[PDB]
Symmetry: C2
Subunit: 209 residues, 2 copies
């Protein structure tokens, strides 16, 4: 008797199950429920960033970048690396902030994890902390979700970031393999940490700036 | 003691509380007793003001506003809607036109609102579009719901087939600030929206 158009996709329960675990990460990271946990705090992210302008003089839609990162802990030990890609897709109606979609692959000696989501490009210039959700994708991290928080250092905003990473096992894993559903989970969790995609304006319209 | 940078914003528990209720909407609409409003197989009469950025081309920069009338099968109007949408970009994977919409719902006894992503290319193809709803006034202020519509193939820009459900949440959804409302609408849209930029080869 259920209306098809009110029923949600098959993966929705698995998605929903990520939500409480995500809210729990901070507490689990603070020393503590015992599952496998990986916490790296006060990392130095050595970023080598190839930033391309589409209309060279100033940032705008169409711009893109790639970057490679090295995660080095306070003692100088490299704990993992990262490949990232980003594209500027549009300007918000309300304030013309530069909206960018990013995807990243984190590679640790014992496994891999991935990231995707929205970044306010205007805010990164201003020096804001950014946060991406993580889904584990292989090895030790395959059963894990987490959070990546990074801030571009004032001295070298394009080469050194300060970064914290937390990944935590979910019992029996998050259960997502399809890229479609992985992207949906990353959108769901990003809702808590990511910028607003297009805030309501004054004039009741979403016209372009 | 906790890392500020791993701690989620204060609204996170209220957002999290929306999730099981949202998953419960389909079952609730088909018959726990709360206040519930279901309108199925409405005819949505749409009046559309569409602006082009490069006039002959449908593309990024286009935007529109529209007025909608919800008429039940018996010909009674049960509410109206004002909406706005913009074409923001073409997906890397398949160049589909991605768009974003915000809408305000007005019923005789209250108000509700909507926002979310639309694949403008797939909508041509006859796919259903779905936006989460947050109540914003009157009877519905304490409610969340779902709006699903499909443009009629014979009159794709003026007639839609539409279903609406809104359901009371115990103690209201608890969101008043626009930023938290936008986050809740994004959170619930993750379940129903198109993929915004699928990974490429």
């Amino acid at each position: 008797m259920m209306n098809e158009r009110f029923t949600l996709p098959a993966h929705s329960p698995a998605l929903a199950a990520l939500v409480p675990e995500f809210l729990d990460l901070a507490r689990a990271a603070s020393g503590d429920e015992e599952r496998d946990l990986a916490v790296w705090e006060n990392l130095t992210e050595h970023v080598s960033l190839d930033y391309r302008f589409a209309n060279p003089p100033v940032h705008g839609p169409g711009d893109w970048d790639t970057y490679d990162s090295r995660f080095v802990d306070p003692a100088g030990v490299e704990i993992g690396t990262l490949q990232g890609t980003g594209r500027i897709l549009y300007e918000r109606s309300s304030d013309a902030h530069l909206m960018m979609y990013y995807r990243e692959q984190l590679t640790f000696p014992d496994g891999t994890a991935q990231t995707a989501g929205w970044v306010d490009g205007t805010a990164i210039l201003g020096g804001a902390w950014q946060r991406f959700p993580i889904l584990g994708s292989g090895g030790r991290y395959g059963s894990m979700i987490g959070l990546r928080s990074f801030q571009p250092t004032p001295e070298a905003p394009h080469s050194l970031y300060r970064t914290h990473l937390v990944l935590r096992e979910i019992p029996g894993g998050h259960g997502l393999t399809d890229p479609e559903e992985i992207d949906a989970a990353l959108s769901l969790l990003g809702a808590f940490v990511g910028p607003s995609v297009n805030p309501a304006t004054g004039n009741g319209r979403l016209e372009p700036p």
